[PDB]
Symmetry: C3
Subunit: 221 residues, 3 copies
Amino acid sequence: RPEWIWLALGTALMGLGTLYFLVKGMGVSDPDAKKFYAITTLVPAIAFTMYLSMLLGYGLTMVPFGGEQNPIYWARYADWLFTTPLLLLDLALLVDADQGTILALVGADGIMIGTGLVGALTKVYSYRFVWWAISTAAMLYILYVLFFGFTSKAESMRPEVASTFKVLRNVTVVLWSAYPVVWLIGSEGAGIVPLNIETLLFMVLDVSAKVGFGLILLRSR
Amino acid sequence: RPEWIWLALGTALMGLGTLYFLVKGMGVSDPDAKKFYAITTLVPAIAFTMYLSMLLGYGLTMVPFGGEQNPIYWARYADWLFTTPLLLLDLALLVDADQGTILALVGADGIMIGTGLVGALTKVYSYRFVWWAISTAAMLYILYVLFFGFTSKAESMRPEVASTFKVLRNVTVVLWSAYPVVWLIGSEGAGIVPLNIETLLFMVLDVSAKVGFGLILLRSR
Amino acid sequence: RPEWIWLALGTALMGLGTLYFLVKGMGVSDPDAKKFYAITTLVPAIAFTMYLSMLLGYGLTMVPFGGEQNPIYWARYADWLFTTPLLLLDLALLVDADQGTILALVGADGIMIGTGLVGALTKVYSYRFVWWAISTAAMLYILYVLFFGFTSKAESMRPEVASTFKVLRNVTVVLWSAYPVVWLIGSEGAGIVPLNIETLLFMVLDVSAKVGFGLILLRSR
Ligand SMILES: CC(C)CCC[C@H](C)CCC[C@@H](C)CCC[C@H](C)CCOC[C@H](COP(=O)(O)OC[C@@H](O)COP(=O)(O)O)OCC[C@@H](C)CCC[C@H](C)CCC[C@@H](C)CCCC(C)C
Ligand SMILES: CC(C)CCC[C@H](C)CCC[C@@H](C)CCC[C@H](C)CCOC[C@H](COP(=O)(O)OC[C@@H](O)COP(=O)(O)O)OCC[C@@H](C)CCC[C@H](C)CCC[C@@H](C)CCCC(C)C
Ligand SMILES: CC(C)CCC[C@H](C)CCC[C@@H](C)CCC[C@H](C)CCOC[C@H](COP(=O)(O)OC[C@@H](O)COP(=O)(O)O)OCC[C@@H](C)CCC[C@H](C)CCC[C@@H](C)CCCC(C)C
Ligand SMILES: CC(C)CCC[C@H](C)CCC[C@@H](C)CCC[C@H](C)CCOC[C@H](COP(=O)(O)OC[C@@H](O)COP(=O)(O)O)OCC[C@@H](C)CCC[C@H](C)CCC[C@@H](C)CCCC(C)C
Ligand SMILES: CC(C)CCC[C@H](C)CCC[C@@H](C)CCC[C@H](C)CCOC[C@H](COP(=O)(O)OC[C@@H](O)COP(=O)(O)O)OCC[C@@H](C)CCC[C@H](C)CCC[C@@H](C)CCCC(C)C
Ligand SMILES: CC(C)CCC[C@H](C)CCC[C@@H](C)CCC[C@H](C)CCOC[C@H](COP(=O)(O)OC[C@@H](O)COP(=O)(O)O)OCC[C@@H](C)CCC[C@H](C)CCC[C@@H](C)CCCC(C)C
Ligand SMILES: CC(C)CCC[C@H](C)CCC[C@@H](C)CCC[C@H](C)CCOC[C@H](COP(=O)(O)OC[C@@H](O)COP(=O)(O)O)OCC[C@@H](C)CCC[C@H](C)CCC[C@@H](C)CCCC(C)C
Ligand SMILES: CC(C)CCC[C@H](C)CCC[C@@H](C)CCC[C@H](C)CCOC[C@H](COP(=O)(O)OC[C@@H](O)COP(=O)(O)O)OCC[C@@H](C)CCC[C@H](C)CCC[C@@H](C)CCCC(C)C
Ligand SMILES: CC(C)CCC[C@H](C)CCC[C@@H](C)CCC[C@H](C)CCOC[C@H](COP(=O)(O)OC[C@@H](O)COP(=O)(O)O)OCC[C@@H](C)CCC[C@H](C)CCC[C@@H](C)CCCC(C)C
Ligand SMILES: *C/C=C(C)/C=C/C=C(C)/C=C/C1=C(C)CCCC1(C)C
Ligand SMILES: *C/C=C(C)/C=C/C=C(C)/C=C/C1=C(C)CCCC1(C)C
Ligand SMILES: *C/C=C(C)/C=C/C=C(C)/C=C/C1=C(C)CCCC1(C)C
């Protein structure tokens, strides 16, 4: 029942992030700047849409495993499924311009979310965590590769990008670790937390990561 | 019942467009020419497949909201979902070669179709138009960005490309405005038109946009 | 019932291919080398995941047309659906660097698998082969274009790449012809083979194509 407040809050917040970014972003940009802007604006857009989809909750109300709906989750996975990739793309793009690197990273990302979804939807009783574990592995890979990202400085311009990246990586890591813990504990893991919590926590992370990173990139640009 | 004539007509027409384009297209092309050819040939291909899928209508016969089937619609959304992107890609490619621009544009496109689909499938009674409205917004964005496309001449070769683009934008705009009106009025909107009409109108636009643009690009190349 | 041995074998085998390739691959690579490595490592990854999904068989146990499950097949199509594209991408990348060429090829690929899936899921009795036929056409196109790939030597470095490609094309063709024959005869075609066979044969091809090509590329690099 409660979910609606959190989700509505999210819809508004994210939507706002989107709009705001369209305005702020636009400005003086053709290449790099516009690339960053577009990439980081699309995210919020998506997230907003999805949030409205989550709030309204279309489709049907069937249970995969529990006594909780399925539209919410599905939506989440769509959100993260496009978001993540794009976000990763942006950050990577700021530093590394290696085809192999990026491609690999986005593929790894792909299976992270995707497999997470697999696990989320698995009907069986105890093996959702098998998938979770694989998701964990993938996530770790993304992070390790981010370690490299930072590490390998190479082609760098102004100092600002370095700092932006520095804060960006911390936020990223944090938020992105939070994801799996919250997932495991609540939502589609064990069910340690009631229900509300899932939505609140997950939304907290969502908005913080997307709008936060958007703002850090706003700071950078 | 009637739908089969329209859809069969479409299957044949589109298929023909595809084949024809394979022949016509092929020729002297490696880079640009081949890029244009491939990009504009794939569309028709897809549309044909989908049209056969629509005509045969696989899956199941369940109703989202009404007393009309669901294979047709779904198919349509797949069609537009790949088509649009590719078409937009081609046109953009002809003028603007800005990563940001293109990416943004295709993302916007993405949510246009996608969200359209969301709205199309929503089970609730009155909120399909909420999604429709968002779809409207997105569409508008695509168009506005096309205004820019034209506007920003910059790097240009022969005069022919300018003219081709000129006719292309008109056709595009027209057809693409028609989409939403027809959608709203018939199919999955209100249901002002019987049923037949949905198929006929939507097909008219389809074939005209894809084969027409293909032919305009045929003219250009 | 039997399927589990084949699928478990596959999970292990493929997983091993993935891991092994992460180790072997990694090494000295930034550009080309890393591109090849990443591209060819992702495949196995995917295949593994999917194989675990196939072995465990989540979702539900409904029949499209027969008395055999649906998770297996679905999984297969996901596997091939990403795999193929990536594999094709890698091979193409080794020779041809033509946007048009590649894009076209991957689009053709796209409909190959995709349409194959369409056919696979069609509920009707006799028209699965219509789709199959279209899939056949597409496959053929991929192969013909590969004929060109070989044919058009152009920009070439060392001799090793030529040989690698030479073995790669043979393997590719072979395996890829095998697919459709096995499909038609067993699984979702007629049902000439019991059930086991489908899994065994299809897995044989899978592992051989992915790990084999991976190894040929390992040889090359
Ligand atoms: C399906 C949905 C749900 C998922 C949506 C995800 C979405 C696909 C992700 C968006 C990422 C986009 C924005 C990529 C951006 C491309 C970039 C603008 C192109 C610039 O181009 C220049 C360099 C190439 O670098 P460079 O080193 O010079 O090499 C290049 C040789 O290719 C050339 O040709 P050659 O070398 O032969 O001459 O930047 C090229 C570097 C990279 C940025 C290229 C990215 C390729 C492509 C878009 C990735 C698709 C990912 C999928 C396969 C995901 C699979 C999911 C799995 C779980 C299965
Ligand atoms: C390599 C990576 C990438 C990973 C590969 C993963 C691969 C993509 C797998 C996904 C396959 C999914 C779609 C299977 C979902 C099956 C679904 C539950 C069953 C459909 O039945 C209707 C369902 C409820 O099931 P129900 O019928 O009740 O099932 C059985 C009960 O009768 C008894 O169950 P029990 O025994 O437990 O009691 O409800 C309706 C629910 C549906 C609408 C669920 C769809 C999820 C979400 C909306 C999809 C997102 C779409 C894209 C953004 C994805 C991009 C992919 C790209 C990379 C290309
Ligand atoms: C679900 C929950 C329960 C799970 C939570 C798990 C949590 C995410 C995991 C913790 C993992 C931590 C330990 C990561 C550690 C990173 C490490 C500090 C970064 C290394 O770099 C250190 C710099 C400062 O050192 P300094 O030497 O000055 O560095 C500059 C040079 O690199 C020169 O610069 P240059 O090279 O550019 O010239 O950064 C200083 C770093 C700060 C920014 C540290 C941030 C604190 C903390 C992690 C925030 C917690 C917030 C959320 C988890 C909230 C949860 C919400 C809940 C309700 C779920
Ligand atoms: C999932 C399905 C249903 C949807 C299918 C849609 C399908 C993905 C769309 C097809 C569009 C394709 C054909 C793109 C063509 C790429 C083009 C050939 C690559 C050429 O490359 C050169 C320039 C880069 O330009 P340039 O300015 O020089 O910059 C580049 C820096 O990236 C490099 O690296 P760096 O700069 O760091 O050195 O052209 C690069 C410009 C653009 C053309 C790049 C496009 C990237 C990628 C393919 C877009 C994927 C879109 C998704 C995320 C959709 C999301 C859906 C949403 C609703 C969520
Ligand atoms: C940011 C953008 C991109 C937007 C994000 C959007 C996101 C992608 C959302 C899509 C999620 C979809 C798939 C949910 C569909 C649920 C479906 C209706 C339910 C499944 O149940 C079987 C259905 C009929 O439902 P039914 O069971 O009757 O439902 C309830 C009744 O019991 C009582 O209903 P009521 O209360 O109204 O009486 O029939 C079977 C119908 C299915 C086969 C429908 C699938 C649609 C179409 C074929 C998908 C295209 C696939 C790709 C081309 C998409 C590319 C995505 C990429 C960008 C990666
Ligand atoms: C669902 C339905 C009911 C909804 C229908 C809605 C409809 C789509 C919306 C109408 C929107 C219209 C008003 C758009 C206006 C565009 C505007 C004219 C273009 C501006 O440019 C004008 C040029 C000629 O001026 P000129 O000065 O010579 O221009 C050359 C210089 O740019 C120098 O050139 P350069 O810069 O290159 O050197 O173009 C002249 C333009 C013509 C090509 C105008 C086309 C007419 C009309 C729109 C066709 C209708 C067809 C379909 C809607 C059919 C419906 C089917 C139904 C059953 C649903
Ligand atoms: C949805 C899921 C299920 C499917 C997943 C499939 C996944 C999308 C496939 C992965 C393939 C990826 C890895 C592509 C790699 C891109 C590569 C690194 C970018 C390098 O970039 C440089 C050259 C461009 O070459 P070059 O000749 O110099 O031209 C370029 C002009 O674009 C620039 O701009 P301009 O020319 O204007 O200046 O390499 C560019 C050449 C090509 C490699 C570009 C590829 C574009 C894009 C990624 C393809 C998407 C495919 C979809 C539409 C599939 C549809 C499915 C159908 C059944 C509907
Ligand atoms: C141009 C190309 C690309 C081709 C375009 C093709 C296009 C993509 C089409 C796909 C549309 C699919 C998803 C439709 C599937 C409908 C499904 C069977 C019905 C859903 O109902 C639940 C089903 C069992 O059906 P059921 O309810 O029993 O049906 C009727 C009975 O009541 C009586 O039947 P009968 O009359 O025969 O007795 O079970 C649950 C099964 C589902 C989970 C099936 C999903 C398949 C697989 C997991 C999807 C992979 C996802 C991605 C990797 C795809 C990437 C796409 C990208 C290119 C973007
Ligand atoms: C489902 C099943 C039943 C269906 C099976 C169908 C089967 C796939 C279809 C057969 C199609 C065949 C006939 C393809 C023919 C290719 C042809 C030989 C290649 C041409 O090139 C010839 C070279 C050697 O000539 P040579 O003159 O020395 O060439 C070097 C110069 O190009 C200079 O070099 P360069 O230009 O670089 O300087 O290659 C010599 C080529 C060998 C590598 C030939 C391989 C043998 C055979 C096809 C293997 C069968 C394995 C599987 C089908 C197993 C099935 C498993 C079942 C249980 C299903
Ligand atoms: C805007 C949304 C963002 C940035 C979402 C990110 C989500 C994740 C990094 C999720 C990771 C997960 C796992 C590692 C395992 C369980 C499933 C997930 C999706 C919670
Ligand atoms: C070959 C097919 C083409 C070019 C199809 C294009 C379709 C559209 C531009 C559809 C637009 C829509 C909206 C703006 C809102 C309602 C849903 C749509 C898909 C009709
Ligand atoms: C690792 C997996 C690989 C390389 C799989 C490849 C699969 C194919 C080439 C499948 C081709 C098909 C047809 C031509 C028609 C029937 C359906 C398929 C998928 C068996």
